[PDB]
Design a protein around this ligand. Structure first.
Ligand SMILES: Nc1nc2c(ncn2[C@@H]2O[C@H](COP(=O)(O)OP(=O)(O)NP(=O)(O)O)[C@@H](O)[C@H]2O)c(=O)[nH]1
Ligand SMILES: [Mg+2]
Length: 367
């Protein structure tokens, strides 16, 4: 055990004690690869694995084919995708039970319970991309995953078009997706715009790319070489291995800050080490030191001691180009409560969905 001070998820702590090996033991599965002799026609490349849009030959429905180049990780991705899509009664559709939600009973962790929370059933399960098939090329034998197709527009093209209310709408959809996967005992670990497909005309959002996702097990020390540099939480950068779902809320917050302040990426590190320095230059060294002390973290071998930086208030990122998005107190408070060094302090997905910034979206739900 690397960690000196141990940490547990504030919410959804015991999902993978509630659920058994049949649910989370991906090592002990055997993949039934289906040779693609007649099922899927590959058309054009949509991104990059290498990812193609194709067609189901029977129904003529568009699908996505993700060509894989990592055997254990493939089994994990498949188990996660199937666990998420196959759950008959998603937990997030049932009536809210606060005592089954706030499951970590440290006194110091209960102070982070917010006075607001979204306490209603929701359809976040429907925002998880669906895996349709597991195939091999009939000639090359290369393995691939077949998915639901989304008519996406790249975030760099789409996001500048979105109004304040539209950003609120889609970020609420993303939180619903994260609340669902967390309720299922899964951390996405690579939340970023490239992994969020949006079909704007249909107001459709799907969280994709579950290849870094992992099952949350209490006091497990995880690999910190996950996420993507610009969205990596401080826990990854300082090698605090006993992290949880709250990693995804950091990534969410970074994505949100980028959208609201029109600064992409928001924390633009030139290296792994510099990524942390870029975060500290905003959140400040004082709270950084308090965080290292709380968990008794020693920085990884690449790091000199952190220099002293005074916190940069969020309002300093406001300009005439972004004030239509950043010029209210609610968004600043939301961002501030997501981008915290201490993962325990961050809003959970339900708490974030309850935040005042989402009031206009919540008011339109009931029909
Ligand atoms: N139009 C469209 N594009 C898609 C769809 N699914 C994936 N893509 C494109 O293909 C890219 C890569 O898919 P992804 O599953 O993230 O593959 P990955 O290799 O695991 N990427 P990462 O480096 O983030 O781990 C996406 O960023 C996206 O641009 C889709 O349903 N529709
Ligand atoms: Mg991706």
């Amino acid at each position: 055990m690397k960690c000196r001070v141990w940490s547990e998820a504030r919410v959804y702590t015991n999902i993978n004690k509630q659920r058994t090996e049949e649910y989370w033991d991906y090592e002990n599965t055997v993949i039934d690869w289906s040779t693609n002799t007649k099922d899927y026609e590959i058309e054009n490349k949509v991104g990059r694995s290498e990812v193609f849009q194709g067609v189901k030959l029977d129904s003529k429905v568009k699908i996505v084919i993700k060509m894989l180049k990592k055997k254990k990780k493939i089994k994990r991705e498949i188990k996660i995708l199937t666990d998420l899509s196959n759950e008959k009664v998603p937990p997030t559709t049932l009536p809210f039970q606060k005592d089954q939600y706030y499951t970590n009973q440290k006194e110091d962790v209960l102070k982070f319970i917010r006075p607001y929370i979204f306490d209603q059933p929701h359809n976040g399960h429907a925002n998880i991309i669906h895996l349709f098939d597991i195939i091999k090329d009939p000639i090359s034998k290369t393995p691939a995953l077949v998915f639901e197709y989304v008519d996406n527009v790249d975030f760099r093209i789409l996001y500048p078009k979105l109004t304040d209310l539209e950003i609120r709408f889609y970020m609420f959809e993303l939180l619903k997706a994260l609340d669902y996967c967390h309720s299922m005992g899964i951390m996405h670990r690579d939340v970023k715009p490239h992994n969020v497909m949006i079909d704007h005309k249909n107001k459709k959002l799907r969280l994709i790319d579950w290849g870094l996702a992992e099952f949350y097990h209490v006091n497990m020390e995880y690999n910190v070489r996950v996420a993507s540099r610009f969205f990596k939480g401080p826990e990854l950068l300082v090698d605090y291995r006993m992290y949880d779902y709250s990693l995804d809320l950091w990534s969410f917050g970074t994505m949100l800050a980028s959208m609201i302040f029109k600064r992409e990426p928001f924390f633009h590190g030139t290296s792994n080490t510099d990524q942390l320095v870029k975060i500290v230059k905003v959140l400040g060294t004082s709270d950084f030191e308090k965080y290292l002390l709380k968990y008794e973290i020693t920085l990884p071998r690449e790091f000199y001691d952190m220099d002293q930086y005074i916190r940069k208030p969020w309002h300093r990122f406001i300009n005439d180009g972004n004030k239509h998005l950043s010029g209210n107190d609610e968004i600043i408070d939301l961002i501030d409560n997501l981008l915290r060094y201490d993962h325990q302090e961050r809003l959970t997905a339900k708490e974030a969905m309850g935040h005042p910034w989402f009031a206009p979206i919540r008011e339109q739900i009931e029909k």
